[PDB]
Chains A and B, each alone.
Chain A
Amino acid sequence: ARVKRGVQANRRHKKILKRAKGYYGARSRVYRVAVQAVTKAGQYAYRDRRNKKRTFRRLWIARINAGARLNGLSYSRFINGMKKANITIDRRVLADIAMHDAATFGALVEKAKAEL
């Protein structure tokens, strides 16, 4: 019962080369190089699923700091004032309000500043 490897080997290599579409040079063309580039891409993507949650909180905090300093407060006093006022609005939503609704963010700063 002799088994030829041609058809399965072909479809196996085509899966990897398909995942390597758009890569430079040998990285999208030749299997020995494509298979390393796909594995490294998956490794980076796994690490960056974690890191993106850090990067976006970084961004929200920056925008909230700018919004609060426009209203006369720093981030570390504004967040303390929210926690003292029992306001549960998350940083994602607070940054959205600071960016797209300046009067509402002014009202939130007023509440935090009255709490201090």
Chain B
Amino acid sequence: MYAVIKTGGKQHRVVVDELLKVELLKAEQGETITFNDVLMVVDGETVKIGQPVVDGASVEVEVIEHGRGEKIRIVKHNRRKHYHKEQGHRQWYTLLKIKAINA
């Protein structure tokens, strides 16, 4: 049992009880989200490929928390041009636990 779902402009192949980091979601911690635009469900030797979505199939996830990622130093340097600039970055993510995949 696995499914292909969409979150955050990205696609994820997921299985049940997997912990997945995705782009930050406007969803309270501990709440359950249902994805009803799953792209494929493979629950064994049976393959349901959506064109573009598998109608009826749904993946329920729960929000564990919203965190910030690892700091990245962004360094820009123009040599001989008296130019330098540094910047910090931490990307927000939300962590989802895949609770159920219904084909």
The residues of A with any CB-CB pair to B shorter than 8 Å are: 39, 41-43, 45-46, 49, 85-90, 92-93, 96-97, 101, 103-104, 107-108, 111
Contact = CB atoms under 8 A, between A and B. Distances in A.
14 contacts: A39-B77, A42-B75, A43-B77, A85-B51, A87-B39, A88-B52, A89-B4, A89-B11, A89-B49, A92-B11, A97-B13, A101-B42, A104-B42, A107-B47
Interface residues of B, number: 22
B26 interface: no
A101 B47 CA distance: 11
Given A45-B73, A90-B10, A103-B47, 6 more contacts: A41-B75, A42-B77, A42-B86, A104-B40, A104-B42, A104-B47
Q: Which 6 A-B pairs have the closest CB atoms?
A: A42-B75, A88-B52, A90-B11, A107-B47, A86-B51, A93-B11
Interface string B65-93: 00000001111110000001010000000
Interface of B: 4, 10-13, 39-40, 42, 45, 47, 49-52, 72-77, 84, 86
B74 A42 contact: yes
Contacts of B75: 39, 41-43, 45-46
A86 B11 contact: no
Contacts of A43: 75-77
A101 B45 CA distance: 10
A90 B52 CA distance: 12
